[PDB]
Ligand binder design. Structure first.
Ligand code: 396
Ligand code: CL
Length: 258
């Protein structure tokens, strides 16, 4: 196999229904990569289409410091592989879990920095006429800390008529309603909530009354004091009217983030 011959597998770093992810040394170049090895979907299937969109997204989203770099993808056995930049700080989700246990969260300057860096990655994705569709802390990677958007498994063109919905803790209501007129603003909504998690919030709801309440534009409770200016930004990014949310470009240019 290419995998076995070109790479020394060092550590399993992620597991799922879908893949495993391994941290690997490439024998020839001496660098470490994250490699995801998933089961090759059935040719011609809607699932292969999805799989290959991740690959096509990666191969047009290799120029940005806030999007995980792609190196290669290939097929072999009944396996599909993708070889990506290794981020050695793990996911934002794990940094959040650790913080939760020690009751020490991202402080406002760190939250702004998180917001801005991921904001830059979305502005880039969005300028390629693409939308990420699954922004959440387990899809943000940490490498000065750098945050990088990864897991382009839900990526779609901005005017697609059909969309695979991302995680429901982060899902904007308009997408759940199958209204795709303003898909970029779904990423904006998911990002605010990602920043709310980083700020120390309880785990977000998947359904039920608390789910619906956030979708009315109410920020979950954050266990620390933030500037009014910053809270207002987060709250407008979850506005029930998607047009009210800032675009990624307005976000990066925002005076709160200057
Ligand atoms: C599950 N997982 C990771 C896990 C870790 C991680 O847990 N590393 C173990 C060491 N801990 C110790 C405290 C720091 C992190 C990591 O550093 C990076 C990745 C990681 C990366 C990636 C992915 C990934 C997600 C979707 C599709 C394909 C990939 Cl390769 C999935 C990944 C990626 O693209 N780039 C990455 O660095
Ligand atoms: Cl998450």
């Amino acid at each position: 196999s290419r995998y076995t011959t070109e790479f020394h597998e060092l550590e399993k770093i992620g597991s799922g229904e879908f893949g495993s992810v391994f941290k690997c040394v490439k024998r020839l170049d001496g660098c470490i990569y994250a490699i995801k090895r998933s089961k090759k979907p059935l040719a011609g299937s809607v699932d292969e289409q999805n799989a290959l969109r991740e690959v096509y997204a990666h191969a047009v989203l290799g120029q940005h410091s806030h999007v995980v770099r792609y190196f290669s993808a290939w097929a072999e056995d009944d396996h599909m592989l993708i070889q990506n930049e290794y981020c050695n700080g793990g996911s934002l989700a794990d940094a959040i879990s650790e913080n939760y246990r020690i009751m020490s969260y991202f402080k406002e300057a760190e939250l702004k920095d998180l917001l801005l860096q991921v904001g830059r990655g979305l502005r880039y994705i969005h300028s390629m006429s693409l939308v990420h569709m699954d922004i959440k802390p387990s899809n943000i990677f940490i490498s000065k800390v750098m945050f990088k958007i990864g897991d382009l498994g839900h990526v779609t063109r901005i005017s697609s008529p059909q969309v695979e919905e991302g995680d429901s803790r982060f899902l904007a209501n308009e997408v759940l309603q199958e209204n795709y007129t303003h898909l970029p603003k779904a990423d904006i909504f998911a990002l605010a909530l990602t920043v709310v998690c980083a700020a120390g919030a309880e785990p977000l709801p998947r359904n039920g009354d608390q789910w619906h309440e956030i979708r009315q534009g109410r920020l979950p409770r954050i266990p620390q004091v933030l500037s009014q200016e910053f809270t207002e930004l987060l709250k407008v990014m979850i506005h029930p009217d998607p047009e009210r949310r800032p675009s990624a470009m307005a976000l990066v240019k925002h005076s709160v983030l200057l």
